[PDB]
Design a binder for this molecule. Structure first.
Ligand SMILES: [K+]
Lengths: 119, 334, 150
């Protein structure tokens, strides 16, 4: 299969090293190839949210940074997820570590601006 | 006493502002931030949404209120309109729309007779409408006595008296003179130090609860001329007096209060996420009544409790909604 | 309301302190973290942050993580600032989006720094009027300009 399918399937791998590994590849793809990444929004949103509640602090951070990077995709395809993401990202706002809470604030704040009067 | 949680419902998306029991007590409706009204029917032991009303309002729906007949439902929303929904075809559709308010409409209420409808808005005004039919609505009076945002309008249970709570820390009564044929303000109730959020009459209608932003609830008694106590009204109209003030029971603003017409119990929806039940003392005097908190659920919701409403058919059954997006039905046992 | 009697201690509190008796270490919310949330909010009219205008200050922030309470005191640039409510509203929206919903936020004008502080404080404390204000598209757009991070 394609490397993209292997990167997506790596998000379900129980090993934290594999999760940090694939997340470091997915974030630049979300920022530089948003039109292609938009096909897999449903599995991207789902798996990123699951990884934001992992035992590893580094995984939770990387997962939320991808949630922030997701906002670079076309807004018209993110809006059907905007409500559940803002509800889901409320939990990492109360995470036990400052470093991950900071990323949760940053990611959730950009999801508030999707349906924004400003362009 | 004990407060028992029976059901938790999460139909809406976002904060949920208002809930109201149908006069049959087997159905309720709810409105919220999602700009939609959900009608909930009870089948067996589970509550479920039978119909979803959307596109009726462009902005948030603050309150919904059932007709005394129970046929049709009215909703006050922030889009400066008050929509009328009707199930004439076996399904609910919006037949009429009441416009006129300058700003967001905060509250609706139906009179005992069912032919009078009252609304209030952020434009400091209180409107009264006349219902000659489902195809006809006529504005009866436009009142601007309140100096600030008017929070709630509630009708008298036995008579056609209107009560309004406002951001100006006051409550106002409205009665129409028979010779004058025009609506007018009866009296002004000034004991709260902050925004008066909710008001509800007792069973007979000679008393009144009011909850406010000052973290207190107050009991108001109606004094007609010739009272034994000696209170005199310079005008012919009746005067209300603060005969009881409960303080220190709530940590934050109290957004709603409901006085049951079956049990006489009082429930409060507070900003500290807590529902508290008050009952009048057995030996409480009619000029200085004493109310005691019999039970409470400090963790009733995860966020602010927005509304509480007793069930007119089922005695001791309470419903509530919150900013956490949940509707919870409770059962209190004295 | 009334303070707990000095002779009594709440059981849920006592157990919760004993629960805390038993990396993985949790990081409490502190004044610095809240200050970092509001210090870079832009002034609606000037190319400066609320920190640079001393509108928000770290020692004007009070917070208790355990008691789920945050208090914000902001000082308007002038005693008759016609933007005091807008500025205070921008602080609420940022904190409303950035803080867990368990936190009850109070945003008030620093005492004696504005002529209409009581009236302004009452508006910002009214969650219904705050909610209705955010449904104003022009108002929410101006707030988003102040809340934007760049
Ligand atoms: K976008």
């Amino acid at each position: 299969p394609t490397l993209l399918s292997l990167l997506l399937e790596a998000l379900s791998c129980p090993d934290s090293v594999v999760q940090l590994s694939t997340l470091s590849c997915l974030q630049p793809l979300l920022l530089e190839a948003p039109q292609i990444m938009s096909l897999h929004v449903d599995t991207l949103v789902t798996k990123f949210l699951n990884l934001s509640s992992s035992y590893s602090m580094a995984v939770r951070i990387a997962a939320l940074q991808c949630m922030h990077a997701l906002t670079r995709l076309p807004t018209s395809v993110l809006l059907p997820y905007k409500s559940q993401v803002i509800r889901a990202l409320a939990k990492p706002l109360d995470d036990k570590k400052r470093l991950v809470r900071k990323e949760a604030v940053s990611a959730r704040g950009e999801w508030f601006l999707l349906g924004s009067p400003g362009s | 006493g004990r407060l028992i949680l029976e059901h938790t419902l999460q139909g809406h998306k976002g904060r949920i502002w208002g809930v109201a029991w149908h006069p049959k007590g087997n159905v309720f409706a709810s409105c919220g931030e999602d700009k939609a009204i959900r009608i909930w029917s009870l089948t067996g032991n589970t509550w479920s949404t039978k119909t979803i009303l959307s596109d009726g309002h462009k902005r948030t729906i603050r309150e919904i209120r059932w007709s005394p007949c129970g046929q049709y439902l009215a909703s006050a929303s922030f889009d400066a309109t008050t929509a009328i929904w009707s199930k004439s075809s076996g399904e609910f559709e919006c037949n009429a729309t009441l416009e006129g308010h300058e700003n967001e409409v905060k509250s609706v209420s139906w009179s005992r007779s069912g032919g009078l409808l009252a609304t209030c808005s952020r434009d400091k005004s209180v409107w009264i409408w006349e219902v000659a039919g489902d195809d006809e609505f006529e504005c009866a009076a436009v009142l601007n006595p309140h100096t600030q945002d008017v929070k709630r309008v509630v009708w008298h249970p036995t008579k056609d008296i209107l009560a309004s709570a406002s951001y100006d820390n006051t409550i106002k009564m409205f009665a129409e003179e028979p010779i004058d044929n025009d609506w007018d303000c009866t009296a002004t109730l000034t004991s709260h130090t902050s925004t008066v959020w909710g008001i509800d009459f007792d069973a007979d209608g000679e008393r009144l609860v009011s909850c406010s932003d000052d973290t207190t609830i107050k009991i108001w008694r109606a004094y007609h001329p010739g009272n034994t106590a000696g209170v005199a009204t310079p005008d012919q109209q009746t005067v209300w007096k603060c005969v009881c003030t409960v303080s220190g029971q709530h940590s934050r603003a109290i957004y709603d209060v409901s006085w049951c017409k079956l049990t006489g119990l009082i429930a409060t929806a507070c900003g500290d996420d807590g529902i508290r039940i008050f009952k009048e003392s057995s030996d409480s005097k009619p000029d200085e009544p004493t109310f005691e908190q019999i039970t409470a659920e400090e963790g009733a919701h995860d966020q602010d409790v927005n509304s509480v409403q007793w069930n007119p058919v089922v005695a001791g059954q309470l419903i509530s909604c919150s900013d956490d997006g949940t509707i919870k039905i409770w059962k209190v046992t004295e | 309301g009334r303070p707990t009697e000095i002779e009594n201690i709440n059981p849920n509190v006592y157990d919760r302190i004993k629960e805390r008796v038993l990396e993985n270490v949790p990081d409490p919310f502190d004044k610095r973290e809240i200050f970092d949330l509001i210090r870079n909010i832009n002034d609606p009219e000037h190319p400066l942050t609320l920190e640079e205008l001393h509108v928000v200050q770290e020692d004007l922030i009070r917070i208790n993580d355990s008691q789920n309470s945050v208090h914000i005191s902001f000082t308007p640039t002038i005693p008759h600032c016609s933007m005091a409510t807008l500025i205070g509203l921008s602080i609420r929206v940022k904190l409303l989006r950035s803080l867990p919903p368990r936190f009850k936020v109070t945003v008030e004008i620093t005492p004696g720094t504005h002529a209409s502080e009581l009236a302004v404080n009452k508006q910002l404390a009214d969650k219904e009027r705050v909610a209705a204000a955010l449904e104003n598209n022009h108002l929410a757009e101006v707030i988003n300009q102040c809340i934007a991070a760049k």
